[PDB]
Amino acid sequence: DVSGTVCLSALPPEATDTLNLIASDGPFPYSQDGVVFQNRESVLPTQSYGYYHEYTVITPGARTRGTRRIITGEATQEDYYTGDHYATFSLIDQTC
Amino acid sequence: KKAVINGEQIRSISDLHQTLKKELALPEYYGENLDALWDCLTGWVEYPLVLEWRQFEQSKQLTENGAESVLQVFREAKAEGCDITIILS
């Protein structure tokens, strides 16, 4: 299950930069970005293969891909953020 | 890199993830779940890797096929071209 809905302005500012790269289809910094996300723990709502895709949210300073990601769905503004390496997810509200 | 899992000793999925975090030298922030393990096999682990999973059919029992889900992740990474050899006993 999703752990709540969080305003985009309460997430790290790099999550807005990832949404803006999704909207222009890149270019992305990591070759994992844009691959299908299989939702293997079934934390997000169960959907067929190909509904979700994942993208890194940079962590400034980390020097690795780190723990933060956005996963997109296909419904309008259906974007989820995890900041703990896929253990939990929240729905992003991009209007606040 | 060689990783050994003694399958008769793992009775929780948590200890399976902790044993993977040690034997594959995953990041300290490893999320201990299947989507984090897939992210680490496609972006962090050293290769070639040899994974010896001894007494696999015992691990299947105790875990409900928490073990089979893990082993399916490794088989999918190998099918994408990561150089993994899986040896069960």
Any overview of this molecule?
Chain A: It is found in: Secreted. Chain A: One of its GO terms (molecular function) is RNA binding. Chain A: Keywords: Disulfide bond, Endonuclease, Hydrolase, Lyase, Nuclease, Secreted. Chain A: Disulfide bonds join 7-96. Chain A: Belongs to the ribonuclease N1/T1 family. The complex is a heterodimer of chains A (96) and B (89). Chain A is α+β, with helices and mostly antiparallel strands and 96 residues long. Chain A is built from one helix and six strands, in the order βαβββββ. Chain A has one domain: Nuclear Transport Factor 2, Chain: A (Roll), CATH 3.10.450.30. Chain A has a six-stranded mixed β-sheet with strand order 1-6-5-4-3-2, covered by helices on one side. The longest helix of chain A is centred in the first third of the chain and has 11 residues, at 14-24. Chain A is globular. Chain A starts with a strand and ends with a strand. The two termini of chain B are 19 Å apart. Chain B is globular, with a radius of gyration of 12 Å. Chain B has a single domain, classed as Barstar-like (Barnase, Chain D, 2-Layer Sandwich), CATH 3.30.370.10. Chain B has 89 residues and is of the alpha/beta class. Chain B is built from four helices and three strands. A three-stranded parallel β-sheet of chain B has the order 1-2-3, covered by helices on one side. The chains are: A alpha+beta (96), B alpha/beta (89). The interface between A and B is medium-sized, with 14 and 16 residues.
Order of helices and strands of chain B: EHHEHHE
Identify the strand order in the major beta sheet of chain A: 1-6-5-4-3-2
Gyration radius over CA of chain A = 12 Å
Alpha plus pi helix count of chain A? 1
Number of domains of chain A: 1
Main beta sheet strand tally, sense and closure of chain A: 6 strands, mixed
Strand content of chain B: 15-25%
Question: Cα-atom Rg of chain B, whole angstroms?
Answer: 12 Å
> In total, how many domains does the architecture of chain B comprise?
1
Q: How helical, in percent, are the residues of chain B?
A: 40-55%
Protein name (chain A): Guanyl-specific ribonuclease Sa
Catalytic activity (chain A): [RNA] containing guanosine + H2O = an [RNA fragment]-3'-guanosine-3'-phosphate + a 5'-hydroxy-ribonucleotide-3'-[RNA fragment]
Subcellular location (chain A): Secreted
InterPro entries (chain A): N1-like (IPR000026), Ribonuclease/ribotoxin (IPR016191)
